[PDB]
Amino acid sequence: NFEEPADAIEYRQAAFGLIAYNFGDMGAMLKGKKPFDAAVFSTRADNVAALSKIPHEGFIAGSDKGDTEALAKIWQDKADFDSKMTAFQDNAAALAVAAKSSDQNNIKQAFANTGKSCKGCHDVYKKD
Amino acid sequence: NFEEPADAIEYRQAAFGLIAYNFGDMGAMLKGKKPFDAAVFSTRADNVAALSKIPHEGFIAGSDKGDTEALAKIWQDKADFDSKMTAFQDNAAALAVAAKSSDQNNIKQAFANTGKSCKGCHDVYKKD
Ligand code: HEC
Numbered sequence: 158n159f160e161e162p163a164d165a166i167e168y169r170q171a172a173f174g175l176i177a178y179n180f181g182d183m184g185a186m187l188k189g190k191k192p193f194d195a196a197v198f199s200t201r202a203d204n205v206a207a208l209s210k211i212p213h214e215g216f217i218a219g220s221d222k223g224d225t226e227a228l229a230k231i232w233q234d235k236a237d238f239d240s241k242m243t244a245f246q247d248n249a250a251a252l253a254v255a256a257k258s259s260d261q262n263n264i265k266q267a268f269a270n271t272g273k274s275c276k277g278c279h280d281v282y283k284k285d
Numbered sequence: 286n287f288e289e290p291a292d293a294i295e296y297r298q299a300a301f302g303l304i305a306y307n308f309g310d311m312g313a314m315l316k317g318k319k320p321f322d323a324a325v326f327s328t329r330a331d332n333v334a335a336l337s338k339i340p341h342e343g344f345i346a347g348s349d350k351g352d353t354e355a356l357a358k359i360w361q362d363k364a365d366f367d368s369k370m371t372a373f374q375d376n377a378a379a380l381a382v383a384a385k386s387s388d389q390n391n392i393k394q395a396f397a398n399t400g401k402s403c404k405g406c407h408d409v410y411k412k413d
């Protein structure tokens with residue numbers, strides 16, 4: 158669906174920026190930079206779960222040229238990248254579910270598992 | 286949560302782009318420009334309904350200044366802006382519901398209802 162590679166790059170970048178902003182606000186609440194607010198937290202978790210469904214589509218074959226932080230490795234090992242992306246989506250969905258209840262230990266664990274998705278994928282598939 | 290006002294503008298622009306990509310795909314399928322897949326159409330409608338809740342947060346005071354197509358009018362008439370935005374969130378949700386059926390007439394009308402809200406807002410609050 159992308160007319161040029163730049164548009165696929167822009168799409169996936171835009172989605173991850175949105176993900177980072179919303180995910181970071183949950184982080185702030187759990188790290189103690191701001192008080193935990195259950196209502197805002199659940200909006201952020203819902204946002205991350207919905208946004209997680211977006212960027213995969215932008216990783217079109219060979220779009221490692223130009224203004225992208227995606228590595229060529231993505232398309233060398235695309236099944237592994239896809240496995241990570243699916244796990245991330247599933248993690249984000251579990252965080253959204255956890256945010257609908259009061260149990261803080263369950264939220265905190267769900268958040269950690271989702272955060273590990275980010276780091277694990279970036280380590281292998283994103284420029285430093 | 287924006288570190289600088291440019292960030293708020295980039296956030297809302299990024300969201301609108303994602304909305305446009307998904308809504309545009311849906312309209313291509315309704316207008317004969319690419320093959321129709323009801324499952325894809327539905328999940329795009331769910332993307333739009335989730336995304337529709339994202340850009341409002343970026344419309345912070347003073348962010349008519351910067352690299353933006355938002356008009357100063359937004360902040361004079363923010364009640365009206367917010368009424369249009371919530372109505373958009375509502376109509377995007379309604380399109381997502383319609384997309385769970387095979388009632389093509391109802392889907393076409395839901396899609397038009399959502400399109401009208403894009404235009405209605407842009408006509409008042411976005412630069413030409
Ligand atoms: C692979 C399965 C990934 C997962 C899971 C997550 N990210 Fe990521 N992200 C990935 C790549 C390959 C890229 C580069 C995209 C490009 O074309 O440049 C990114 C990029 C980001 C960015 C920067 C976006 C931008 O403005 O250019 C951010 C802020 C980011 N990613 C954050 C992020 C977070 C917080 C995640 C977990 C909640 C996360 N990503 C997961 C690959 C993958």
Ligand code: HEC
Nearest residue numbers: 298301302305308353354355369370373402403406410411
């Ligand atoms: C007001 C309540 C709006 C509704 C409803 C919709 N949009 Fe809009 N949009 C609006 C403004 C004020 C702006 C300018 C943002 C800025 O800071 O420049 C926009 C912008 C867009 C864009 C351009 C994004 C970019 O890359 O800069 C697109 C593609 C866009 N809007 C599309 C869009 C669609 C398809 C909508 C309905 C499904 C829709 N918007 C609704 C205000 C509002």
